[PDB]
Design a protein around this ligand. Structure first.
Ligand SMILES: CCCCCCCCCCCC(=O)O
Lengths: 94, 94, 277, 252, 252
């Protein structure tokens, strides 16, 4: 009644730390890989269900820019000031 | 440069049965790969790849709110039949 | 005379003339000028390419060799100089000559001979002026095996006798090559079986040059250093080629180590900000 | 239309519908040796159409990772019809040559080759401490290829492209008779090389007058289902071929 | 081949390999004001190459649902180099302009734009009971766009395409200096507009001499995996620029 290793999610690595067997109800959160940020509102985690079955999960990571560049002359305006999801095409204002 | 030889370093044209034949077969030159680039605290790698060979590079990017300390990129150097990154990855100060 | 092209005054344009558009595939280098892609003013250009002449470029004395020879016969020190003439041991001049495949010219050879007295505790002397002898030995001539060899008789071989203090000895020589032009590069062999020597040394043979002190002997050990200088004149060059990129390793071949095409930089868009008020 | 062109030498004829003019050596066109420049007193032989014709060499495949190729003449034509026979039986030779490199693809493929003729292309060794072997310089109509990385061979040529195996910059090879084969505009490249040497004539086995190098500056690329086989064929025809010093054939 | 053309004004040059001739205003070509038609007694200034050059404006993206765009000059060039500086410091102005709209795709894309220059393109308001605001008529090099449906804005322009925001039929805009950009044959459009006005000169901030409209009659379309980004860039260069009434720069 123990789940094995979480499924494989593209561009994401599950935070095992650093177990092997996950008891039922065990909630594993996936972290997006470098150059990737979690798409807001999307499922980024799974859970060990009955039958040693992990919940379902799919790609939740889109390519994104690093946090905007820190400048001496200008500071970021809201909400960019606290954003981390900058998909290609994102335009920020200082 | 960037490839490691696998097999014989030479061959002789010896007499083989009814004719002259090369003593050793052609060797193999397999791509030298650098070790997985290092992940850095509060930063990512832009367009991270599967493998990295001679002269290929990896460019880092600090997350939002962090500042880059060091060169943006490193490069796979291949002295000497073993692959090695040019230097240490940049660092991200918050 | 060797003046540069002037810039014709050009005005607005709007036609089917496409001087800016071309195709490098043809192997043809665009002959466009500023007046073809913008409005220009008339400019009487008086600049001259007089110093870009192959003559003015190569006609400058450049060191090609240097050796040291002693006076006294102590230890295993050479008392005379020997040298298989060629300009492949001095990267500077060698790189210029190699800008072209073939060369033809006369040459002015100058020698800078200087002497000295080796260190010692008790070396009080009073040696008269040192006289030197430089002898050229074309391929085949008898070579001296000592500072007293009969070969130094210079019966027919050209030779120079110079005494220190006077102006450095000099003398001109014509176009020696047995070919119609000197060859800086020879992608061939010395033997028909495609083996033996490969390249320059396979055909070039300007002979040898020997030097020595005509003075019998010195109380205490002394040495002299002769520096040979070449200055081609009445120059002619053919087939230009890519300048040497990799450092020179051997003076007998073109061996080299994989060198970078050029220096590096941050990125293709990197340009240093030099304006910071 | 200057795109289409036709070449006729001997019993051979080449056709093109996508060429880019014709480069003529250093402005000169092949010509027989004049009396006021000759040295060999014996009357030379001029097979003409017998040796001055188009000889096609083994084709080569251009791949997304190809670094380049190179041939050495007249050596590479030692086994080509009567042109090779005269090389064996004669001590001295002299020829022009009309290099014609073919390579077609499609409006959907991309890449750019650099067809160049390098006179006296003296090359270096992989191991700077050793020498090179003729076998590694030129091997008949079989082409030697450049490598995107350093070589290690004992008596091999430093095939690393960036230095063209001469210790120079590849981007400067444009100073030699050349043409490019930009697939989006080209289809072939022709170069008429005149006899270039510091001597009226010379041996054709011992001396490699010039080297033909085909180095791609724009990697071959294409999409899926697009012909992956893109060959590069080289054709060359001697011009004003003269021979002197007739004797017993040379045993290769 | 009349397909290829080159334009040179000042230190700027435009190239084209797929154009369709050049429309020259109403048969006239830009010219300086003559003495028998001048009014301003002060000697005008003619920066020439300083202001008469190609100025590229912010590019625009053509989408399968794009309805059109429009710019107003000389207002749109108020912040363009020295041409804009002379507008500030002078009371009167006069210029020609060479409109050059670029837009390339591929033999697999399709669409047709209508590049037109409408003199005195007085436009109407969304709410027929109210008036329009300059801010909604022209906003610098930033283009205003037409909508496939009716607008509602308070002081906005009736962007509904079918009426071109003028209360007329779009199919009749061909009565103004124009050209089309039929991707299957074109690649750009050039129009040389001569100074058109009921006065020798006029203010360049208060008056919008003409409006450039780019309305697509053939919707942009293509198959899968075909570049979806098809930008439309507008470049314009003043001609025979004259200025009168020099005074303190105008605060925008
Ligand atoms: C009397 C001294 C004679 C010296 C002969 C020097 C000849 C130099 C020839 C250089 C050939 C070359 O650089 O390719």
């Amino acid at each position: 009644q123990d789940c094995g290793l979480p499924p494989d999610v593209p561009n994401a690595q599950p935070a095992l730390e650093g177990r092997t067997s996950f008891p039922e109800d065990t909630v594993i959160t996936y972290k997006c890989e470098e150059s990737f940020v979690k798409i807001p509102g999307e499922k980024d985690s799974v859970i060990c269900l009955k039958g040693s079955q992990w919940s379902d999960i799919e790609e939740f990571c889109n390519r994104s820019c690093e946090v905007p560049t820190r400048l001496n002359s200008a500071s970021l305006k809201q909400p960019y000031i606290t954003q981390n999801y900058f998909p290609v095409g994102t335009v920020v204002e200082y | 440069t960037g490839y490691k030889l696998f097999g014989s370093t030479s061959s002789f044209c010896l007499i083989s049965g009814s004719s002259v034949q090369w003593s050793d077969p052609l060797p193999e030159c397999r791509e030298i790969y650098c070790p997985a680039p290092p992940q850095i605290d509060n930063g990512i790698i832009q367009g991270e790849r599967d493998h990295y060979g001679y002269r290929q590079s990896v460019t880092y990017a600090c997350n939002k709110g962090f500042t880059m300390i060091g060169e943006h990129s490193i490069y796979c150097t291949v002295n000497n039949d073993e692959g090695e990154w040019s230097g240490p990855p940049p660092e991200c100060r918050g | 005379i060797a003046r540069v092209a002037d810039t014709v005054a050009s005005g607005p344009s709007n036609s089917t003339s496409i001087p800016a558009l071309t195709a490098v595939e043809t192997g043809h280098t665009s002959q466009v000028e500023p007046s073809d892609t913008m409005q220009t003013r008339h400019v009487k250009n008086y600049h001259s390419r007089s110093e870009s002449t192959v003559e003015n470029f190569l006609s400058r004395s450049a060191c090609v060799y240097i050796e040291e020879y002693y006076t006294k016969d102590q230890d295993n020190v050479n008392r005379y100089m020997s040298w298989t003439i060629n300009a492949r041991r001095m990267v500077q001049l060698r790189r210029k000559f190699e800008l072209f495949t073939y060369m033809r010219f006369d040459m002015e050879i100058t020698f800078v001979i200087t002497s000295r007295q080796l260190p010692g505790t008790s070396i009080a002397q009073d040696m008269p002026p040192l006289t030197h002898q430089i002898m050229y030995i074309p391929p085949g001539g008898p070579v001296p095996n000592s500072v007293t060899d009969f070969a130094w008789q210079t019966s027919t071989n050209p030779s120079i006798f110079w005494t220190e203090g006077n102006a450095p000895p000099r003398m001109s020589i014509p176009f020696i090559s047995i070919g119609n032009a000197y060859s800086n590069f020879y992608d061939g062999w010395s033997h028909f079986s495609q083996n033996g020597v490969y390249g320059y040394n396979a055909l070039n043979n300007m002979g040898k040059l020997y030097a020595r002190h005509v003075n019998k002997d010195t109380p205490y050990q002394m040495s002299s250093t002769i520096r040979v200088y070449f200055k081609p004149k009445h120059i002619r060059v053919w087939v230009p080629r890519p300048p040497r990129l990799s450092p020179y390793i051997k003076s007998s071949n073109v061996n080299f180590n994989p060198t970078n095409l050029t220096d590096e930089r941050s990125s293709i868009t990197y340009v240093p900000d030099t304006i910071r008020p | 239309s200057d795109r289409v062109r036709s070449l006729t030498l001997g019993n051979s004829t080449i056709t093109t519908q996508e060429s880019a003019n014709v480069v003529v050596g250093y402005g000169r066109w092949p010509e027989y040796l004049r009396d006021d420049e000759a040295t060999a007193e014996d009357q030379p032989t001029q097979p003409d159409v017998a040796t001055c014709r188009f000889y096609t060499l083994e084709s080569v495949q251009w791949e997304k990772n190809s670094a380049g190729w190179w041939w050495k003449f007249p050596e590479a034509l030692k086994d080509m019809g009567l042109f090779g026979q005269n090389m064996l039986y004669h001590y001295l030779g002299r020829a022009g040559y009309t290099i014609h490199v073919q390579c077609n693809a499609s409006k959907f493929h991309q890449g750019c080759l650099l067809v160049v003729c390098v006179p006296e292309a003296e090359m270096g060794c992989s191991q700077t401490d050793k020498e090179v072997a003729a076998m590694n310089l030129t091997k008949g109509e079989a082409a030697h290829k450049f490598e995107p990385t350093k070589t290690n061979g004992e008596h091999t040529v430093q095939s690393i492209v960036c230095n063209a195996g001469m210790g120079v910059g590849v981007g400067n090879l444009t100073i030699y008779p050349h043409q490019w084969i930009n697939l989006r505009t080209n289809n072939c490249a022709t170069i008429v090389m005149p006899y270039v040497n510091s001597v009226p004539m010379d041996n054709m086995f011992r001396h490699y007058n010039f080297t033909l190098m085909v180095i791609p500056f724009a990697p071959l690329d294409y999409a899926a289902q697009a012909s992956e086989y893109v060959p590069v064929t080289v054709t060359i025809a001697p011009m004003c071929a003269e021979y002197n010093g007739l004797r017993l054939a040379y045993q290769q």
